[PDB]
Amino acid sequence: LAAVSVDCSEYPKPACTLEYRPLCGSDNKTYGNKCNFCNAVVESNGTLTLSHFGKC
């Protein structure tokens, strides 16, 4: 059904491609891309999640 989420199994990373593809969280703050999103998830320990693609 209707979910939104990028895959984050492989995080956090040491380095990020500087393509800008923002992903706003449930926190309603922006993570610049699937890197900085999925970092802030895997640090978050599962609990942070994707409210919408793009920026807040």
**HEC-encoded secondary structure of the chain:** CCCCCCCCCCCCCCCCCCCCCCEEECCCCEECCHHHHHHHHHCCCCCCCEEEEECC
Number of domains making up the chain: 1
Residue showing tokens 């640090």:
43
- DSSP-assigned beta bridge partners for residue 23: 31, 54
Instruction: Give the span between the Cα atoms of 6 and 50, in whole angstroms.
Output: 8
- Expressed as residue numbers, the domain containing 4 is 1-56
Instruction: Give the span between the Cα atoms of 5 and 19, in whole angstroms.
Output: 18
CATH code at position 5: 3.30.60.30
Closest CA to 34 of 14, 46, 56, 16: 16
